[model samples]
Structure formats: structure tokens, C-alpha cells
Target: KLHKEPATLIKAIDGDTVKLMYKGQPMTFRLLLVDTPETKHPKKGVEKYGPEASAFTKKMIENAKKIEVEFDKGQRTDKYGRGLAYIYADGKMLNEALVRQGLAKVAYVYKPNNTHEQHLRKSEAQAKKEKLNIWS
Candidate 1:
């Protein structure tokens, strides 16, 4: 089973990234199996729909009554050293919600760290078919 730990959202950096406190330490987390458009990339600048995506994530996390982070058995962190995990807000996976709302796309897929690949992909496809956000 995956390891799930309680977390507190400090701030949302973007749609798929956030600053959080877990285990009494502040950590940066990049959501697993999902990618949102760039809003604060130094080079990429801001992409279309990026602000909306960021706002969606910000609102969700800010209003969440509970938050949790889950780790996969394969990878512990991203190349940038940010923790990689599935984030849940109020028992709802924020990753899936972003994809389902067409605010994000399923990306960075790798085995063992892909516990939610199928589910995320399905949501992405649904969003794409519905012509949501990036899919639009």
C-alpha cells in the first residue's frame, strides 16, 4: 500500500505544484501524474489558461478542510528535489480534480510512481473530449 501522510497547504505555486508542511517540515510538492500550464515559469512566462488553473488549485487547497499527501514506492522526489506525491484535499484527490476539470493534463508518467496513471489519464481524456481548458 502507498504511504499517506497528513499535510497542510501553505500556498499553491501553480496548478500542479504547492508549498506544504508535512511531518513538521516545509516541503515543495509536484503533483504526480498531472501537469498544469505554466504560470510562473521564468522562461516560459505565463501560458494561456495558466492563471485559471492556478486559481482553481489555490481555491481548492485554501478551502480544503483536510489535506493529505501520498507517496509511491518508486520515486521519492523529482529532479528538482520537490517531493512527488498524490495530494488529497478533503478526501478528494486534487490531481484528479484538476484533470477532470480540464485544468491539467496527465503527464510525467513513470512506472511504480504511477499508481494513479490510469485514473488520471481517464480524466484527461474526458476533459479533452469535453473540450475543457487546455483541451479547448
Candidate 2:
């Protein structure tokens, strides 16, 4: 069985980043094992399909009745001080959905944080096969 900690969506920073009210504190979380095209990068600027990816994430979390975050067994935070977690909206995993739609890539893979990596990879492969979004 999987474990989940409930959270409230404060805001979505981008496709792979979000501000969540976790444990009564608003924290920024970087979605584990996935990287979406940048929409808010200072140097990289807006990347191709970035807005679409960001919009998808915003819509999903905003519309969901429930939101939760799951942490990996290893590191709990990234170098930038953002929390590292897998976000869930309703019962669906936001990370997996982004990859399945080809809006995000399976990346930044750290050991023990690979709880859903295999499944995410398969989802990415399927999206690539279908030539979806980023794979298009």
C-alpha cells in the first residue's frame, strides 16, 4: 500500500512545481522524478509547450476535490530548498499524468525516490509512441 499526506493547493508555480499548505505551512514542492518544460525560468525563458504544461497542472490541482503529497525514503528536499514530493489530486498522481501526456519528462532520478519511476517511464514511452505534446 502507498502512503499519502494530505495537503491544500496554495498555488501552482509551473508544471512540476507547486506551493502547498502541508502541515499548516505553505511550502514549495518540486515534483519528484519529472521535469516539465520551463515556463518561469529566468535564463531559459518560456520553453516550447511550457504554457500548456503549466496550465494542465494548474487545472488539475485546482479542480480536484482532494490533494496530497508523498515523500520518498531518501532526500526530502532539493538543492534549491524546495520539498521533493509526488503530488496527487483526487486519486490520480500529478507526476504520472504529466508524463503520460508528454508534458513532462522522467528525470532527476535519485535512488529511493524511484517509487513510481518504472510506471512513469512506461507512461512516457506510451506517450512518445503516440507522439503526444512534447513528443510531437
| Candidate 1, 1-136: lDDT as tens digits | 9867899978899988999998999999999888788888779989988999899999999999999999987978989999999999889999999999998888867888988899888888899999987877
Cα displacement (angstroms), candidate 1, residue 129, comes to 1.4
TM-score of each: 0.95, 0.96
Clash pairs for candidate 2: none
Model 2 TM-score, 2 decimals: 0.96
Q: Candidate 2: where are CA atoms >4 Å away?
A: none
lDDT for model 2: 0.93
**Candidate 2 lDDT, 29-122, residue by residue in tens:** 9999998999887799899989999999999999999998999888889898899998999989999999999999999687987888999999
Candidate 1 stretches with Cα past 4 Å from truth are: none
Question: Global CA lDDT of candidate 1, please?
Answer: 0.89
Residue range with the least summed lDDT across 10 consecutive positions in model 1 = 2-11
